[PDB]
Amino acid sequence: QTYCDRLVQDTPMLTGHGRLSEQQVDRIILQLNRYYPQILTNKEAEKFRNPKASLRVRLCDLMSHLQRSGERDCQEFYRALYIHAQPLHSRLPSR
């Protein structure tokens, strides 16, 4: 599977309530913003960290963003997920 295909497959599980916490998501966003490649701009990172919007809505929007942005971005997401949510990372069905 390509990483894009994996992400499409894993999206319903990843976005299920309880799977990722706000703290995990926040750290994933930082991982995708602060380094190289930069997957998320500062403005995008702030949007996805916005405390006023429900976490699930922000996550679904993040998944859509990564899927449209291509293979490299999806690969970086999986690395960020390994770093900040290893238990979940290990349980994903595309594994």
From Swiss-Prot:
Q: According to its UniProt record, in which tissues is this protein expressed?
A: Expressed in ovary, testis, placenta, skeletal muscle, kidney, lung, heart and liver (at protein level). Expressed in thymus and brain.
Q: Which cysteines are joined by disulfide bonds?
A: 4-74
Residue stretches making up the CARD domain: 5-95
What's the domain of life for this entry? Eukaryota
Quaternary structure note:
Associates with BCL10 by CARD-CARD interaction.
Main function: Plays a role in inhibiting the effects of BCL10-induced activation of NF-kappa-B. May inhibit the phosphorylation of BCL10 in a CARD-dependent manner.
Could you tell me what this protein is called? Answer: Caspase recruitment domain-containing protein 19
Organism lineage: Eukaryota, Metazoa, Chordata, Craniata, Vertebrata
Name of the gene this protein is made from:
CARD19
